[PDB]
């Protein structure tokens with residue numbers, strides 16, 4: 300029993316964190332095989348022109364108390380790839396994956412190439428992440444683990460004025476309409492990840508919380524009309540299919556749970572809580588719920 | 598900016614998780630140097646659990662009865678001893694991944710990271726707090742016994758908890774790494790219930806200071822309170838008494854934000870009285886009590 304916001308074990312990623320120093324800027328880099336990946340803003344804009352002025356010895360890479368030697372450098376979108384002479388002996392089995400809004404991942408927050416904390420979060424529908432980052436956290440990475448494979452999905456680049464965070468996949472493509480430059484940028488109006496709220500309602504049922512259940516069911520169209528009103532993301536047939544296992548396990552059809560969600564949106568919780576929360580939690584995917592309520596290991 | 602429930606990076610602890618089997622029971626063990634630590638109830642059957650005599654059950658066991666598996670490598674047990682409710686299995690190989698570590702016993706209200714494991718394999722990491730009733734509100738399934746709670750301040754792992762059991766209310770009970778239970782619990786299937794839980798007041802105040810540091814001031818008021826009047830009020834909401842030690846501990850946060858500890862106590866009194874009125878504090882509609890004053894300073898400053 301119990302339901303916690305749980306991150307993946309960060310060990311496979313910790314063995315990849317290095318410090319990258321260029322001029323006065325110091326941030327984090329991800330050392331996989333003989334390449335160190337980091338935000339291209341470490342050289343700070345015309346990034347091609349700024350980069351052409353740099354030599355390999357301008358980039359100081361530090362892996363623990365060992366200085367790595369940079370033997371090449373290239374840019375791929377908003378990520379700088381520093382070729383080093385030494386392949387990381389701790390390189391795990393990995394992939395670079397681009398995630399969709401609503402998908403969750405673990406963030407290993409780092410400062411000076413040293414991991415300080417791990418937390419779970421979701422890529423918001425507005426492509427920002429509600430992270431916890433201070434100055435020096437750029438280059439920190441987001442990831443998932445699938446069996447023994449680390450899927451790198453995020454690299455931290457910046458903080459928006461509202462305190463939310465923006466970054467790229469490991470190929471340097473930003474999530475959202477953001478750019479890596481000092482200019483006026485604002486996150487769009489955010490919405491609630493509906494499939495994730497439903498998955499969390501199933502987790503609550505699995506944990507013995509049933510007060511919000513009702514005898515009612517709804518149509519996918521009627522629920523989406525209600526979801527559009529309360530700034531909730533539309534629920535697709537794919538989402539309904541994805542919630543199938545949880546629906547079969549609890550005996551509560553997705554549209555049966557949707558009618559619970561609809562009543563919760565129009566009436567509130569009425570002093571009650573669900574899994575110790577007075578708000579509807581949307582940062583657990585259906586897969587996160589099954590993984591935690593079944594104990595999958597890595 | 599931002600405030601998250603943040604766990605310590607679990608890597609130093611992952612390299613210590615092993616699987617311990619004794620008969621039909623399989624749980625997790627913590628491999629540090631040449632010793633594997635695990636709950637002593639690994640020697641029991643589900644039948645023995647009502648009134649086990651661990652000394653009697655342990656004397657009947659030999660080293661080869663304990664199967665220890667570190668990854669795909671079977672470790673050889675060369676000795677065994679019991680220390681309170683923990684079984685210490687001496688093995689023939691020192692863990693090459695042994696970090697710098699300490700065994701620390703924590704007090705209620707203290708937080709720590711939990712590396713949940715099944716079959717000696719880590720499955721997740723989350724942040725926890727020792728509740729005032731000495732239970733932890735964890736997320737644990739069958740086979741999670743032996744999973745550990747820890748803090749990683751500096752490069753040293755302070756082991757503070759080993760999971761032993763789930764109470765009927767779904768909350769969890771365990772021991773420090775010396776095998777001493779937190780709370781009035783015993784490693785027996787007898788009727789045991791957690792005492793009425795209360796809110797960790799000093800932690801809620803620390804979290805209100807984290808909100809101020811992050812630009813949330815809506816809950817502040819022009820009032821102050823005596824420490825005694827605050828405690829008379831807070832007790833009525835099932836909040837732990839706030840001691841002079843707690844007031845002193847909140848000093849740095851008070852100095853940083855310019856809000857006296859007793860002024861923040863008056864905002865808390867008002868929040869208890871009024872609720873949030875549709876508002877949130879740091880993305881939460883409830884008063885969060887699983888961030889210590891030390892956690893707030895670490896996350897907001899470094």
Ligand SMILES: O=C(Nc1cncc2ccc(F)cc12)[C@@H]1CCOc2cc(F)c(Cl)cc21
Pocket residue numbers: 340432433434435436437456457458464478479480481482598
């Ligand atoms: O975003 C940045 N810094 C920080 C990131 N995450 C949390 C931070 C929290 C506080 C803080 F002061 C800096 C934090 C840097 C430095 C400020 O300006 C820019 C502008 C940019 F276009 C880019 Cl791509 C990066 C930055």
Ligand SMILES: O=C(Nc1cncc2ccc(F)cc12)[C@@H]1CCOc2cc(F)c(Cl)cc21
Pocket residue numbers: 300638646737738739740741742761762763769783784785786787
């Ligand atoms: O607590 C136990 N198991 C589990 C622990 N943590 C979450 C669990 C969640 C579910 C579950 F079925 C077992 C879980 C075991 C087996 C049941 O009985 C006892 C009795 C005891 F005296 C002791 Cl010390 C341990 C246990």
Ligand SMILES: [Cl-]
Pocket residue numbers: 702703704707
């Ligand atoms: Cl303590």
